[PDB]
């Protein structure tokens, strides 16, 4: 599950080996590799890995499906992208080896679908966007609520807006509050250790009985 | 006889020449004869200065009846000893505190609660605690009180001091003393709801 070096090799597909029936079906070869990547990557080097993929280009050209899948994925047609995503749900299941990580994959998939589109905006409107992702308004916002559980933007929603506003502005005052929290626990520890010097140097302990 | 210059020690010979007798060895009595009323002429009147070493080692041969019927009379002059005769290094005043006052402690909620000693008696309590409201089991008694007994005020003075400077130093303290200390600390800042202080 350290799929970083996994895709590091997946990109490394060298057709000129040209034969091993136990190796992988080139359908599975490309889908396997590139989707380990599509989990692992950050977009830039991977587009490099993808748009500027040369050694994999046959492996590239194997599945036109997954090819334009990840293409317009990074181009963000999330609707049909996710569509064929959880359509090959069943067939990755049909992979013995795609089955064991379907949850992992689809998890990080819709995660990074978020990560992809959400980053530029400032206030997450949902209406047309939900029309895209094809998640019900509640299911949409609860996806979002999930997102709240971990998300990166100091963001809030008028539900009646049916729309987020994303992360806030200041980090300075943030530093301020962490600073004061710092200082308070500092003084706390400090008295603690004063009293600790007392208890030690005052011989203090607890017997066993 | 048994107090010829000994009461003269407390009155007169404390802070005197070769009179270093009572303090150093750290109470409703201090002599158990018929003249338990003569236990109350002048002991809690003046001070607890350098008369420390000897006469307690001399007079630890009676050690009986620390709970004489002077529950208000010698209690009165010990509230004086709080006020009038608080002392020099009053940590060792925990003796009567230990022997009698916990003795007295046993009766307080045994009557109602510490009706009569708290307010004034903190005078020589703090005469005892030199600097930082320094730790004693006086804390233990009164603060178990203010925790469970519905009387939380007199240590409201003493609430969040970083009190320190305990005395092991010939006893003058006990594991249970600090145990109770941060224990009622916990329970009271619970009830007082400064939960972080007590968790600390």
Number of helices of chain B: 8
The whole-angstrom Rg of chain A is 25 Å
Distance between the termini of chain B: 54 Å
Q: What order do the strands of the largest sheet of chain A run in, or round the barrel if closed? A: 1-2
What percentage of residues of chain A falls in helices of 4 or more residues? 55-70%
- The helix-strand sequence of chain B is HHHHHHHH
Cα-atom radius of gyration of chain B: 17 Å
Q: How helical, in percent, are the residues of chain B?
A: 40-55%
Biggest sheet statistics of chain A: 2 strands, antiparallel
Net shape of chain A: extended
Distance between the termini of chain A: 51 Å
- Percent strand of chain B equals under 5%
State the helix count of chain A: 11
PDB class: ligase
Keywords: Cullin-Ring E3 Ligases (CRLs) COP9 signalosome (CSN) Deneddylation, ligase
Entry title: Structural basis of Cullin-2 RING E3 ligase regulation by the COP9 signalosome
Chain A: COP9 signalosome complex subunit 1
How does this structure look, described?
This is part of a larger assembly, with chains A (209 residues) and B (200 residues). A two-stranded antiparallel sheet of chain A has the order 1-2. Chain A is built from eleven helices and two strands, in the order ααααααααααββα. Helix content of chain A is 61%, strand content 3%. With 209 residues, chain A is mostly helical. The longest helix of chain A is centred in the last third of the chain and has 30 residues, at 172-201. Chain B has 200 residues and is mostly helical. Chain B has eight helices and no strands. Chain B has helices spanning 6-13, 54-59, 73-83, 94-111, 118-128, 137-148, 175-191, 195-199. In chain B, α3 (73-83) packs across α5 (118-128) and α6 runs parallel beside α7. The longest helix of chain B is centred in the middle third of the chain and has 18 residues, at 94-111. Chain B is globular, with a radius of gyration of 17 Å. Chain B starts with 5 loop residues before the first helix and ends with a helix. The PDB classes it as ligase. Keywords: Cullin-Ring E3 Ligases (CRLs) COP9 signalosome (CSN) Deneddylation, ligase. The entry is titled "Structural basis of Cullin-2 RING E3 ligase regulation by the COP9 signalosome". Chain A is COP9 signalosome complex subunit 1. The organism of A is Homo sapiens.
């Amino acid at each position: 599950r350290k799929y970083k070096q996994a895709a590091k090799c997946l990109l490394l597909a060298s057709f000129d080996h040209c034969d091993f029936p136990e190796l992988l079906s080139p359908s599975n070869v490309a889908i396997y590799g590139g989707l380990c990547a599509l989990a692992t990557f950050d977009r830039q080097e991977l587009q490099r890995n993808v748009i500027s993929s040369s050694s994999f280009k046959l492996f590239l050209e194997l599945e036109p499906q997954v090819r334009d899948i990840i293409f317009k994925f990074y181009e963000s047609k999330y609707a049909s992208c996710l569509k064929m995503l959880d359509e090959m749900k069943d067939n990755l299941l049909l992979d013995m080896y795609l089955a064991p990580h379907v949850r992992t994959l689809y998890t990080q998939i819709r995660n990074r679908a978020l990560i992809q589109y959400f980053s530029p905006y400032v206030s997450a409107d949902m209406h047309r966007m939900a029309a895209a992702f094809n998640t019900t308004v509640a299911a949409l916002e609860d996806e979002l609520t999930q997102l709240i559980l971990e998300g990166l933007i100091s963001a809030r929603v008028d539900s009646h807006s049916k729309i987020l506003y994303a992360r806030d502005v200041d980090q300075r005052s943030t530093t301020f509050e962490k600073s004061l929290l710092m200082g308070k626990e500092f003084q706390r520890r400090a008295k603690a250790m004063m009293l600790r010097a007392a208890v030690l140097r005052n011989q203090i302990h607890v017997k066993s009985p | 006889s048994a107090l010829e210059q000994f009461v003269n020690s407390v009155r007169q010979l404390s802070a005197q020449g070769q009179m270093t007798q009572l303090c150093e060895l750290i109470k409703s009595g201090e002599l158990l004869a018929k003249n338990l009323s003569h236990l109350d002429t002048v002991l809690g009147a003046l001070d607890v200065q350098e008369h420390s070493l000897g006469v307690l080692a001399v007079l630890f041969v009676k050690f009986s009846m620390p709970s004489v019927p002077d529950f208000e009379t010698l209690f009165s002059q010990v509230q004086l000893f709080i006020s009038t005769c608080n002392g020099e290094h009053i940590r060792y005043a925990t003796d009567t505190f230990a022997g009698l006052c916990h003795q007295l402690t046993n009766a307080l909620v045994e009557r109602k609660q510490p009706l009569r000693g708290i307010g004034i008696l903190k005078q020589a309590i703090d005469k005892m605690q030199m600097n930082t409201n320094q730790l004693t089991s006086i804390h233990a008694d009164l603060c178990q009180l203010c925790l469970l007994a519905k009387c939380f005020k007199p240590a409201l003075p003493y609430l969040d001091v970083d009190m320190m400077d305990i005395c092991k130093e010939n006893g003058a303290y006990d594991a249970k003393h600090f145990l109770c200390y941060y224990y009622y600390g916990g329970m009271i800042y619970t009830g007082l709801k400064n939960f972080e202080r007590a968790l600390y």
